[PDB]
Amino acid sequence: SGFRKMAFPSGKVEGCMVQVTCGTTTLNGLWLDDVVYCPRHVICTSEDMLNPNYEDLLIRKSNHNFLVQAGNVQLRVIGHSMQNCVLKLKVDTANPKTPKYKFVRIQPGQTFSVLACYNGSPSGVYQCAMRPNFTIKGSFLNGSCGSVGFNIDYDCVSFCYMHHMELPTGVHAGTDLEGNFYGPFVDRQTAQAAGTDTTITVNVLAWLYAAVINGDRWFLNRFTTTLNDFNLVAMKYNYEPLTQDHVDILGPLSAQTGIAVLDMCASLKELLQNGMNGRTILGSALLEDEFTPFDVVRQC
Amino acid sequence: SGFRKMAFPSGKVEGCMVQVTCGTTTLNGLWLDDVVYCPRHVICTSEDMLNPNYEDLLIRKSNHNFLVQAGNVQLRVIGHSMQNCVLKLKVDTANPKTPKYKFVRIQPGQTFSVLACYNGSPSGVYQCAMRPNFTIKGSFLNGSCGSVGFNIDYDCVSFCYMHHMELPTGVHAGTDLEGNFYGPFVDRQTAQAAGTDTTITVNVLAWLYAAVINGDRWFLNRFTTTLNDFNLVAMKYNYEPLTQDHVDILGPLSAQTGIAVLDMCASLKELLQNGMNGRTILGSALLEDEFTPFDVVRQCSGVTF
Ligand SMILES: CN(C)CCOc1ccc2cncc(N3CC[C@]4(CN(S(=O)(=O)CC5(C#N)CC5)Cc5ccc(Cl)cc54)C3=O)c2c1
Ligand SMILES: CN(C)CCOc1ccc2cncc(N3CC[C@]4(CN(S(=O)(=O)CC5(C#N)CC5)Cc5ccc(Cl)cc54)C3=O)c2c1
Ligand SMILES: [Cl-]
């Protein structure tokens, strides 16, 4: 019993974290085999960030301008190339601790663990979700760039995020491990603001099924709803539209508890209208949206 | 910016997790040097749990009854002994991945990371606190026994908890790594219940300082209070008494934000007496008590391991 925001064990990722330094800038890199992956903004000064010409800044760099440190060992850079917003540093030593891995691009609503690092050293691990506005509500201080997000279903690490920037509202933006940003963000100091955020409906529903599995049913009601009527109401509370894909995805949790997806949608509609009236659901006074249907099945 | 419930990186502990099987019961063990530590209830059958005489059950066991598995390698048990509610299995192979470590007993209100394991394999890591009633609000299924709690200070792992059981309210109980239970619990299947819990006051104050550091100040006011008046109000809402030690411990956060501890106490007094009025603090509608003052400092400074 119990339900906690749980992160994947971080050991497989800790053994990949390195420190990357270019001039005055220091950030984190991910060492897999003989390549160190890091944000390309490591080659920039603060002034360069207004309108950086990364191709022009990179062509002026030589291999020995990049200082890579793995623990107390200096790695030697023997090549470099840029792929989108990530820099790939070819090093002369393959990481003996390289786990079984894949690079995966995730969709909004999907969750992952973040191993926050400073100076190539891991400080903490936490769980978070890719918000519908493509930002993450992380916990990152200056020097955390290059920290990665991942999942470890089985023995394979699926890297899905690399940290690049903090937006003016305190939320975070980054790329997949191929250097493509999530969202309309650019690795440039320009006016960019996170779009209006919304609640991940399919995840709130999954967490309501987690509460039913753990023995709480106070929020259920005798009503049902059509998918269209549910979406008309949910949009009024800044909730993401629920699609037929989301209904199909909730199938196993619906069968396990015996509560139809549209019947759980009716409880959600009522919770939005009434609030919790001094009650909690799985130790929370808010409707939680950072657990996916898959996360609920894995933990319960 | 940002404030998350953060756990220590778990790698140093992952390399110590093993599977221990004795008869029909399978649970997790902690392999440090040539010893595997695990709950002594691994020697109990379902019926033995009703009223076990652990010395009598153990004397009938041979080293070959304990099946220890580290990944895909079988470890050979060459000796065994009991220390309180923990079984110590002497194995013939020292763990090459043994980190620098200490066994420490924590106090209620202290936090730690739990590496939840099943069949000797780590599944997840989460942060929690030792409640004032000595239980933990963990997330554990059948097979999680032997999972451990820990803190890291520099390169040293301080093991503070080993999971043994779940109480009827869904909360959890366990021991330190010397086998002494936290709380008035026993490793038997008898009527046991979690006592009435209280809120960790010093931790709520630390989390209010974390909110101020993160730009949330709506709850601040011009007022102050005495420690005595604050404690009279704290005892009314099932909050733990705040001591002069807690006030001293909050000193660095009181200096970083420019808000005196008794001024933050006056803010908490008003939140207790009047609620949040539809507002949130660090994305929460409840007053959070599972971040210690040290956790707030560490997360708002970027301390690494
Ligand atoms: C007090 N400040 C001057 C220090 C910045 O503090 C911080 C604090 C936390 C950070 C967390 N992640 C990523 C950071 N970074 C590092 C690189 C940088 C820098 N900036 S910024 O300082 O304007 C960002 C900010 C705002 N709004 C002040 C939070 C512009 C920028 C543009 C694009 C890209 Cl790809 C990178 C960057 C950035 O965001 C952090 C930066
Ligand atoms: C279908 N379920 C009821 C089966 C097990 O459920 C579970 C489910 C989750 C568990 C999480 N942690 C620790 C468990 N464990 C494992 C060992 C056991 C078992 N119990 S019990 O059968 O009473 C089951 C329980 C109760 N109360 C929890 C519901 C007797 C017992 C006596 C002493 C000691 Cl030291 C240990 C134990 C225990 O608590 C979990 C047990
Ligand atoms: Cl996805």
Taking a C-beta distance cutoff of 8 angstroms, is the pair B273, B229 a contact? no
Residue type, A28: N
Task: Kindly name the residue from A16, A22, A38, A41 that is annotated as catalytic.
Answer: A41
Task: Kindly compute the dihedral angle of the four CA atoms of residues B239, B240, B241, B247, in this order, to the nearest 10 degrees.
Answer: -100
- Spacing of C-alpha B26 from chain mean position: 23
CA distance A201 to A203: 5
CA distance A12 to A142: 24
Tell which residue, B13, B6, B19, B12, has the closest CA to residue B115: B13
Number of Cβ within 10 Å of residue A110's Cβ equals 17
Choose the mutation target among B113, B117, B126 for the interface with A, i.e. most A CBs under 10 Å.
B126
Residue from the list A2, A14, A284 with its beta carbon closest to the beta carbon of B170: A2
Task: Kindly name the residue from B16, B145, B160, B265 that is annotated as catalytic.
Answer: B145
Contacts of B115 in chain A (CB under 8 A): 9
Tell me which method was used to determine the 3D structure. Answer: X-ray
Residue type, B126: Y
CA distance A68 to B193: 54
Residue type, B135: T
Tokens of A163: 């940290």
Strands B121-129 and A148-151 turn out to be: unpaired
The number of the ligand 2 atom at minimal distance from the alpha carbon of A1 is 9
Please indicate if any CB of chain B lies within 8 Å of the CB of A3: yes
- Spacing of C-alpha B170 from chain mean position: 15
CA distance A263 to A265: 5
3-state secondary structure of B287: coil
B139 and A7 within 8 Å at the Cβ level: the answer is no
Looking at all shown ligands, the one closest to residue B169's CA atom is 2
3-state secondary structure of A131: coil
In degrees rounded to 5, what are phi and psi of residue A37? -100, 130
Number of Cβ within 10 Å of residue A87's Cβ equals 26
CB-side neighbour CA atoms (13 Å) of A208 = 31
DSSP string, A46-72: TTGGGS--HHHHHHT--GGGEEEEETT
B2 and A139 within 8 Å at the Cβ level: the answer is yes
CA distance A19 to A91: 13
DSSP state of A40: G
Which residue is associated with the tokens 């020697």? B43
Task: Kindly compute the dihedral angle of the four CA atoms of residues B280, B283, B284, B289, in this order, to the nearest 10 degrees.
Answer: -120
Burial of A104 (0-12, 13-18, 19+ CB in 10 A): middle
3-state secondary structure of B259: coil
CA distance A77 to A11: 25
Tokens of B126: 């989460």
Taking a C-beta distance cutoff of 8 angstroms, is the pair A270, A264 a contact? no
DSSP state of B24: T
For residue A96, give the H/E element and its range: none
Sign of the C-alpha dihedral, residues B50, B51, B57, B58? positive
> Is residue A2 within 6 Å of ligand 1 at its C-beta?
no
For residue A284, give the H/E element and its range: none
Could you tell me which residues come within 8 angstroms of residue B230 by beta carbon, excluding any fewer than 6 positions away? B242, B262, B265, B266, B268, B269
A9 and B124 within 8 Å at the Cβ level: the answer is yes
Map out the domains of chain A with their CATH numbers: 1-14+100-197 (2.40.10.10), 15-99 (2.40.10.10), 198-300 (1.10.1840.10)
Please indicate if any CB of chain A lies within 8 Å of the CB of B251: no
3-state secondary structure of B268: helix
Taking a C-beta distance cutoff of 8 angstroms, is the pair A9, B10 a contact? yes
Smallest CA–CA separation between A168 and chain B, in Å? 10
Strands B148-153 and B111-118 turn out to be: antiparallel
Could you tell me which residues come within 8 angstroms of residue A27 by beta carbon, excluding any fewer than 6 positions away? A19, A20, A38, A39, A42, A143, A144, A145, A146
B26: β partners: B21
Instruction: Give the resolution to one decimal, in Å.
Output: 1.8
User: How far separated are the first and last CA of chain A, in Å rounded?
Assistant: 8
Number of Cβ within 10 Å of residue A59's Cβ equals 8
**CA-derived radius of gyration, chain B:** 22
CA distance B113 to B153: 13
Which residue puts its alpha carbon closest to atom 41 of ligand 2? B142
CA distance A233 to A250: 20
Nearest CA in chain B to A15: B11
CA distance B18 to A103: 29
A118 and B170 within 8 Å at the Cβ level: the answer is no
Sign of the C-alpha dihedral, residues A227, A229, A232, A233? negative
DSSP string, B74-112: EEPEEEEEEETTEEEEEESS--TT--EEEE-PPPTT-EE
Q: Which residues of A13-41 are buried (b: 16+ CB within 10 A; e: fewer)?
A: bbbbbbbbbbeebbbbbbbbebbbbbbbb
Which residue is associated with the tokens 């997360």? B299
Tokens of B200: 């960790």
Q: What is the 3-state secondary structure (H, E, C) of A177-208?
A: CCCCECCCCCCCCCCCCCCCCCECHHHHHHHH
CA distance A36 to A80: 9
Q: For residue B77, report the distance from its CA to the centre of ligand 3, in Å.
A: 44
CA distance B31 to A158: 28
Taking a C-beta distance cutoff of 8 angstroms, is the pair A101, A158 a contact? yes
Could you tell me which residues come within 8 angstroms of residue B80 by beta carbon, excluding any fewer than 6 positions away? B58, B61, B63, B66, B87, B88, B89, B90
Tell which residue, A169, A168, A126, A170, has the closest CA to residue A147: A126
Tokens of A108: 């909004």
Pocket around ligand 2: residues whose beta carbon is below 6 Å from it?
A 1; B 41, 49, 140-142, 144-145, 164-166, 168, 187-189
Taking a C-beta distance cutoff of 8 angstroms, is the pair A111, A129 a contact? yes
Number of Cβ within 10 Å of residue B199's Cβ equals 19
Strands A156-166 and A100-103 turn out to be: parallel
Taking a C-beta distance cutoff of 8 angstroms, is the pair A286, B280 a contact? yes
- Spacing of C-alpha A17 from chain mean position: 17
> Is residue A168 within 6 Å of ligand 1 at its C-beta?
yes
Catalogue the E-assigned strands of chain B: 17-22, 25-32, 35-39, 66-70, 73-75, 77-83, 86-91, 100-103, 111-118, 121-129, 148-153, 156-166, 172-175
Tell which residue, B268, B273, B256, has the closest CA to residue B210: B256
DSSP state of A146: T
> Is residue A140 within 6 Å of ligand 1 at its C-beta?
yes
3-state secondary structure of B186: coil
Q: For residue A170, report the distance from its CA to the centre of ligand 1, in Å.
A: 10
DSSP state of A240: P
A141 and B300 within 8 Å at the Cβ level: the answer is yes
B67: β partners: B21
Tell which residue, A135, A134, A117, has the closest CA to residue A126: A117
Tell which residue, A299, A203, A222, has the closest CA to residue A266: A222
Number of Cβ within 10 Å of residue B218's Cβ equals 12
